[PDB]
Symmetry: D3
Subunit: 136 residues, 6 copies
């Protein structure tokens, strides 16, 4: 089980501020599954407008985080979203949460990858979804 840091991540993904959303890889079973982390703090650029009176992590960004972990899983050992399916959001995610990013490989069919993805906060499920991706 491979474990690596934000420095290794930078060499693997083209994503940068303000939309690189994986801080750390905790466990990685190459080409099979990955456990990554995404710290959530009030000091991130979107919180100021989502929402002014009350900070809420945009759910589309939890999906983005997961798809970035999916990409680490692919690239480890540019990225493009092809499909999102069965996305369910089950908790408002806020400043202070750590966002465990669990993603498993499912299939590859002609340059499209299907992944199963779950984001947890404190053992509970915050969101889940099936992601489909391609590189170019």
């Amino acid at each position: 089980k491979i474990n690596f840091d934000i420095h290794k991540i930078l060499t693997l993904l083209p994503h940068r501020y303000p939309i690189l959303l994986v801080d750390r890889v905790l466990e990685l079973e190459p080409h099979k599954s990955i456990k990554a982390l995404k710290n959530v703090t009030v000091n991130e650029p979107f919180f100021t407008g989502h929402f002014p009176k009350r900070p809420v992590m945009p759910g589309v960004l939890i999906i983005e985080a997961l798809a970035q972990a999916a990409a680490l899983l692919t690239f480890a050992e540019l990225y493009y979203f092809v499909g999102i399916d069965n996305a369910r959001f089950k908790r408002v995610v806020e400043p202070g949460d750590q966002l465990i990013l669990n993603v498993t490989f499912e299939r590859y069919i002609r340059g499209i990858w299907k992944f199963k993805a779950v984001a947890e906060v404190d053992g509970k499920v915050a969101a889940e979804a099936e992601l489909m991706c391609t590189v170019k």
Copy 2:
């Protein structure tokens, strides 16, 4: 009905850097909406996505589709949250210069969940399509 960024601002709580609807082109209240989102290289996400080559992140397209949906909800009538996204497919890369036409049609309401069919078009071709489910709180 049709309105501008100024009415939009009075209807959505979203602000920069994640207010992603510029104009309402048509609103058939409580039924359907065609809204506009201008994509320009002068947006803060393009610097990181991706440094070599600008690409509008697919998820912000979904996000823009949801704010069109909230307008549909809120117009002719408080925070907006996602509960589900199904059958979300991305068919075209969207770039600086494109106008993102945001077509949203209300489908059902059930115990706080609003469901919509959403289609984002650029030049009359489908860039993304998804089914959206959202709720409203506090």
Copy 3:
């Protein structure tokens, strides 16, 4: 041509690269370019908080970046672009999120390091702004 050719020709980057695409190009004579205006632009938070209004000076900036594309095209980080003068600039319409700013620039004259252009920005076939622009190029 598109935002990618544009990126290979101009040194300007965020938050001041204000041309998205080139619609028409009569090489060394004139250019019609496009700048999409959206509320998701960093200057709108400050200009103004109550009511988004595209700042007139940035329309001018967009017109001058177009002029520079006219200059650098059919002809990377270290050749820079500078306003030397602006004459006869008139702002006729307020430009807003939603508007597509059509950037029309025609080359008029070059001498001893200065390019003069006649520039007109339009929104929906109506004149938003017009100016005479004088610019130079260094290192």
Copy 4:
């Protein structure tokens, strides 16, 4: 009359990233003003203009001067609009480290339009000069 960024905040609506006047040093009410604008490399435009060589955009010097003109207009007396720029000349490249002295003398008022003579100086030498036409709406 000498006042600071705090009085300034009460008189002008402009805010970050386009409030470009830091301090007023001299005000002859409704006739002339000397304001101040600190140029530092920690300003959001410098990263794009230009990467690897900071250059204050000339149009933001024009903007700074116009805000000094707005102050001249609003003090000892609600949005602000550019109507015109004429005879704009840029004589020095302005950089991080330079203090910009914003000199604005009122010149005429005809049917809604204020006109001003404007000069921006760095270290006693002229960085930019221009004639500015402005108007106040809603």
Copy 5:
């Protein structure tokens, strides 16, 4: 024990310099344990440093000082001393902000990551 929303009502600080995400334990008028999450998606990381992300030391002091204001204004910046930085704080760290009241407003402060001390300092207000 209280959250970001509560914090927002007690500190005037806002983005990009509000650096307390959550208060884990407060013993009023006496001590506070506070949390500040560190992620690569914070605005300073892009120039500190370009090759290599590294949380500015002075920002850990800022976070501890905010942790200390919370101690002060709940149930209701003049000097730093003996500040030492022992560990580089990085994206992914959960920065635990410990602040005890030591006299009066002086404080002893220790920012811990993963139970190791990241930095420590005396603070006055």
Copy 6:
């Protein structure tokens, strides 16, 4: 020397490069640098929304980068200590922060410095800084 030499010597960038210009340099002994303070800086929007105030810790950071400049001038940057830092003035948009940094001692990988930030000739902040350079 100017912001352009400064860029060639510090690795720091926006939004945390906080020296605009070096005014005097006694190589390996001392430095007088400049930091322009303007409302158009990213931190002011949050510190504080009502009322701009430059944060005390960013003055320290400015002084520390002046020390980096001093260390690197005629020959990554890490803070190791800060001592006897007092803040004696509220610095505002419009102020020029004069960054006075004297080098004192290098023992065992630690550079030590006395640092003073002045506004309008009067003292704004003063501190002893300990730093070290890695990689």
